[PDB]
Paper text:
The HNV F protein is a trimeric type I fusion protein that is initially expressed as an F precursor (F0), consisting of three domains (DI, DII and DIII), a C-terminal stem, a transmembrane domain and a cytoplasmic tail. We found that LayV F and MojV F both adopt a “tree-like” prefusion F structure similar to that of NiV, despite only sharing ~40% sequence conservation at the amino acid level. We show that despite sequence divergence from NiV, the F proteins adopt an overall similar structure but are antigenically distinct as they do not react to known antibodies or sera.
In August 2022, a novel henipavirus (HNV) named Langya virus (LayV) was isolated from patients with severe pneumonic disease in China. Based on the sequence of LayV, published in August 2022, we expressed the F ectodomain residues 1-478 without any heterologous stabilizing mutations. Through iterative particle picking, 2D classification and 3D refinements, we obtained a final structure of LayV F at 3.37 Å. In our analysis, we observed two particle populations that either had the stem domain displayed or not. Several rounds of heterogenous refinements and ab initio reconstructions using cryoSPARC were required to remove particles where the stem was not resolved. This yielded a final map including both the globular head domain and stem and resembled the “tree-like” conformation seen before for other HNV F proteins. LayV F DI is central to the monomer and is flanked by DII and DIII, the latter of which contains the fusion peptide (FP). Comparison of the trimers reveals a shift in the major outward facing DIII helix of LayV F relative to NiV, mediated by an adjacent loop region of a neighbouring protomer, which adopts an altered conformation in both MojV and LayV. The alternative cleavage site conformation for LayV is likely due to the presence of a bulkier hydrophobic leucine residue in position 413 in the adjacent DII (serine in the equivalent site in MojV), which would otherwise clash with the conserved and cleavage-site proximal tyrosine 102 (Y107 in MojV). In fact, our cryo-EM structure coupled with mass spectrometry analysis revealed that only positions N65 and N459 are glycosylated on LayV F, demonstrating that this glycoprotein is significantly less glycosylated in comparison to NiV.
Numbering used by the authors:
A (entry chain B), B (entry chain A), C (entry chain C): 22 to 466
Write the structure that this text describes.
């Protein structure tokens, strides 16, 4: 295991502990986003602006419909006696594709039944007359229809239509139309270029609906405060499954993935702090998080994942290999841990763990309050430990802290420690270092 | 060239292929953004809030007008006999500048005739009375005037002004004024510090106009769906060219670049996959994209560029040098390619290219469906090729795929392959590795 | 010092100079954000939607109130004779925490008097009836109350309530409620998970108030155009200090930090340019900025700081150590500077400094205008210097520039220069380089 005793002596302290979770088997819901609203009540005046808008919508949606049909043409159902019944990808026709694209092509074909079901409700979809509405399909799944422009009209024009001239109606609706179209190009643009591979988060989808993703979740059937783990990590995503160029709408399938708890896997945080070396201040280099899975160590690359209050959530397993030298450190060999000189005025100089306080008392104030006496650590010792045995309250920096009883054998000593090699890391001077060391090899004879 | 036979044996597969495009000679259009609206119809009530707002505008715009004049003072036209007729930078007065800043200072002076043309229309600019409007200059270029607050007032106050008390008018317009000013500080803030160097995308400009960049493009005369290559890569950019502190407006010149297709240059994607090594799973390290230009290889740094469906588009040529060892890989010497151990549960285990499937059948399921038979690859072989000759349909993983005819001499074998060295990369343990290897040199005698 | 003479010979030119500033002792202001508005005038129709909303607010705020109480339970005031009077952290109860979290826990307890003062005004806070309002506390500090939903209602519903049916009122307010709730989850989500450690910028707070941060600054008492140094660098931040689950409001304390000018510390920019080497084009690798503090060199990592027109502003001192080899360069030893081959078509080929122009005239046009004659630099020389002595105006590239008098002894020569080692840097091929060099060590015997 981590053997935290040997780590504490070089300013690495046992931090928080988190569960590891991964995207599991997903549930799905159907949604339709309308590009062309139902113009009822303002049809008399907006005719000139609306006819321009319909052409813009048709021109934008035609390439998408072509790309979708071109993908469906490459997938055929397993009607033959083939025992692994499913769908077959025509690899000779698709030409070049990653496993992701091939899987997405199959998933698009698998999603086509929902597209047909939605298409049979086109007459109802064109008649919603409300900012957002829920409909029932022949498959008895519910369909959420988004109608943002109808919301803008129902709230800003229809209530005051008596005070607005017909010219004003034309101009105002024209502006609202162009505004909405710019929203769609901002949010859906990538998917409109490549609809098979691209996915969109529910937040980004909701940017086309005044960022009101909560209303979308509510109408699909989920409470936005309950889904926090899935919602905030960006795992609630959707993709295009069909498009209609005459009705002007995009059919999206939204995915609500469950989260599988990874068995016997734990993410451990490490808290680095400064330590004394012959009066100088040094810090040990180790990643902020390390993943222990069935006793095996690994590096998480946590920036691509979400650190919740109690778990780390990832789109897929992101564990990376770790160099033998670093594993030495994480297994108690203090002599292999790279260390770096402190230059910044401010660097963390103490930490609390299981009620014990570890501190670099040669570079920060440390005083026993029960005896109003300063605590001195010999210049050989790296870090001091504050214990319940000597004092109940200690001053550290400008704060007072109360601490617990030491759990090891005898008493803690930090002088007989095998320090590691000094290192400096930046892209710029790594090059200089590499070149300089290679000159020795170039000169070897 | 890439010699993809030798690459496939270590799990690098021929991906998609793209044109390389660069920002060319630009067209330009003129725009004015007004900070101060025309207050007609609400002039009676808003006076106290409006007089504060004019002071805030003047205080913001004065330093910009100073910085602009201080730059124009350093550029003088070539009225003397100088044979390379143009404009002269007073380098002793400018003091310290990059080539970019010197060029932008010259371009500001070159733009100043448009500033004079706009300034002679100031009387009309102060009268526009519509949310966005087009004017004709004396030079018979058109000017787009943006007037966002007049849009807010025309839509939300004037239609209901009978129902609002005069105090309510004052408060509501004071809020709209402060809101708009906070938009301007968000979007233009950098350019208001440094107007010569700074550039702003048309999207970011449109954040001052309810994100409606489509309406801006329409009025400048271009259709937002037609410009996608230039628009979405963020190459439609503007900069400040003049400011008026009493009328309270910013004059912008917006740049619509052409794209030049780079001659005899191609960007090639490389798809990595896992492969077997004696029962372990390994991946080869190569960049996702490489650029071949007149048979020269180079590294693109593609994150700074846009990958469209059919081209890679860049603000400038970004080709970087490449290490001899990696060129070795990309010219078929398998022995120099660094390789990394797979630790994640998920890494891509097959890919499709020109209708062939390459797969790592010791680490994923592979079966011939025409004979309902599992496919075995001998433990020396890195990857298996799936061919038309044996089967028309293969299962790979949980998908079925139909595949094309092999094109080489004889039949593919992937056992006699010269593997490269094992590597682990992160900044931290690059540090540890560098120090540890250098101890051999430090000890040599 | 930097010894710019030796640097210019390898295409490194003296750039701009900036002050170094750090976050100092902060002032503070109090703010309350209301989740539940006062429903006056629309209470008849919205009852069904409002009762749902109150439950959502309570469910969201209860965990926050629990986490806050759980933190306050660990801090006790120094009522005993302890001489360093203040507050004591119960480290045995807190368990594991970084110095930052411990300090924030103490700061939360120190902030609790303001929480009590605000809580005694709860009856007034629930009655604001205006989009934003200022109140006076018993401590005579002013409290800013944000009431966004009341603003939306006062501007879009109450002025036209005669034209809206009761059903329409219910639906429209329901949409506004869900929209606002989604804004709150977007902006405050992180703080609602971990309220002790998390901080929010005034801009992000204002996202819950139609991005109108200017109005917030105005009501708290500061002018948004005057605070630019603190405001734009993102240093105006607030954190949660109390929450009420019945009134449904979040109490925030906002921090306005002063900026301390760091004594005898200067940030110096370095402008790299190409230079000739035996007809090839090369660039020297050095960081864009370097920090000289009391004659000591250091690396700034400027991406984490704000580069204003005249100063660099940072949240804390971020100076990092620098390798001896790079310090050699920055101290005049030209032989240690890593250099890289130019491949991109465009790289900066000239620069202006103190009125002198440095240019790579073997790779760019250079002509004297007083004599209409090209300037030739011998293939041994790296960079040419343009001086007042020979010409008053020089053409460089496609621009004309006037230059000053050389200040050194004799005349400038760039041939007898000790060039450094060639280097190539990327994460991918650093691995290949490291592996290849280590094979020599593996083979040494
Ligand atoms: C292997 O790693 C060590 C790390 O300790 C490298 O040490 C470097 O050695 C040089 C020369 O001994 C140091 O140069 C400095 O020179 C000045 C002027 O003489 C002197 O005052 C300094 O005290 C120091 O000796 C350099 O600072 C040092 N660098 C580091 C980061 O420690 C060593 O170069 C590497 N081995 C080889 C063969 O390069
Ligand atoms: C330490 O650095 C030097 C450069 O200063 C490295 O030299 C490199 O050596 C290789 C192998 O000779 C060169 O690659 C190619 O070699 C073939 C056969 O000699 C030649 O025909 C090609 O034209 C090409 O030169 C390479 O160019 C050269 N330079 C660089 C920058 O890589 C040397 O490899 C390093 N030390 C060790 C032990 O590797
Ligand atoms: C140059 O590169 C080689 C790899 O090609 C480095 O080899 C690595 O060296 C360490 C120390 O000998 C090995 O660790 C030990 O491995 C054995 C067998 O797995 C294990 O029983 C020990 O407990 C310990 O972990 C490491 O495995 C080995 N790497 C490989 C892939 O075999 C070598 O260290 C480098 N040379 C220098 C001078 O740094
Ligand atoms: C539009 O025309 C219809 C015709 O049936 C009429 O009922 C309606 O009042 C008209 N509306 C406006 C705003 O002119
Ligand atoms: C403002 O004054 C004009 C007369 O100058 C009047 O016609 C208009 O109705 C007034 N508006 C208000 C809101 O008092
Ligand atoms: C709501 O009820 C009050 C009476 O308490 C009445 O004065 C008010 O006009 C009503 N509003 C609506 C919209 O029905």
């Amino acid at each position: 295991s981590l053997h935290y005793d040997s780590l504490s002596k070089v300013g690495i302290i046992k931090g928080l502990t988190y569960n590891y979770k991964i995207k599991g088997s997903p549930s799905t819901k159907l949604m339709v986003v309308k590009l062309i609203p139902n113009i009822d009540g303002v049809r008399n005046c907006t005719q000139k602006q609306f006819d321009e808008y319909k052409n813009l919508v048709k021109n934008v949606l035609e390439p998408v419909k072509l790309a979708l049909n071109a993908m469906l043409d490459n997938v055929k159902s397993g009607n033959n006696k083939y025992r692994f019944a499913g769908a077959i990808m025509a690899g000779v026709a698709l030409g070049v594709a990653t496993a992701a694209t091939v899987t997405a092509g199959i998933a698009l074909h698998r999603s086509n039944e929902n597209a047909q079901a939605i298409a049979n409700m086109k007459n109802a979809i064109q008649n919603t007359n409300e900012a957002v509405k829920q409909l029932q399909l022949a498959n008895k799944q519910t369909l959420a229809v988004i109608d943002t422009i109808r919301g803008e009209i129902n709230n800003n024009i229809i209530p005051v239509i008596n005070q607005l001239s017909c010219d004003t109606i034309g101009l105002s609706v024209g502006i609202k139309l162009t505004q909405y179209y710019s929203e769609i190009l901002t949010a859906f643009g990538p998917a409109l270029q490549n609809p098979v591979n691209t996915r969109i988060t529910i937040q980004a989808i909701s940017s086309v609906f005044n960022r009101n993703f909560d209303e979308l979740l509510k109408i699909m059937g989920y409470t936005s405060g309950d889904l926090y783990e899935i919602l905030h990590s960006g795992l609630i995503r959707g993709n295009i499954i069909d498009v209609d160029v005459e009705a002007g709408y995009i059919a999206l399938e939204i995915e609500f993935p469950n989260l599988t708890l990874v068995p016997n896997a734990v993410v451990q945080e490490l808290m680095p702090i400064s330590y004394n070396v012959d009066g100088d201040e040094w810090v040990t280099l180790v990643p902020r998080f390390v993943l222990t899975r069935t006793t095996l160590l690994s590096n998480i690359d946590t920036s691509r994942c979400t650190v919740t209050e109690s778990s780390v959530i990832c789109d897929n397993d992101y564990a990376l290999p770790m160099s033998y030298e670093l594993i030495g450190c994480l297994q108690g060999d203090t002599s292999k841990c790279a260390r770096e000189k402190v230059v910044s005025s401010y660097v963390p100089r103490f930490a609390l763990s299981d009620g014990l306080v570890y501190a670099n008392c040669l570079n920060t104030i440390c005083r026993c309050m029960d005896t109003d006496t300063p605590i001195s650590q010999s210049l050989g010792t790296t870090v001091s430990l504050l214990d319940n045995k000597k004092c109940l309250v200690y001053q550290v920096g400008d704060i007072l802290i109360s601490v617990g009883s030491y759990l090891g054998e005898g008493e803690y000593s930090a002088d007989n420690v095998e320090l590691g090699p000094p290192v400096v890391i930046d892209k710029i001077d790594i090059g200089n270092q590499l070149a300089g060391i290679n000159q020795t090899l170039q000169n070897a004879e």
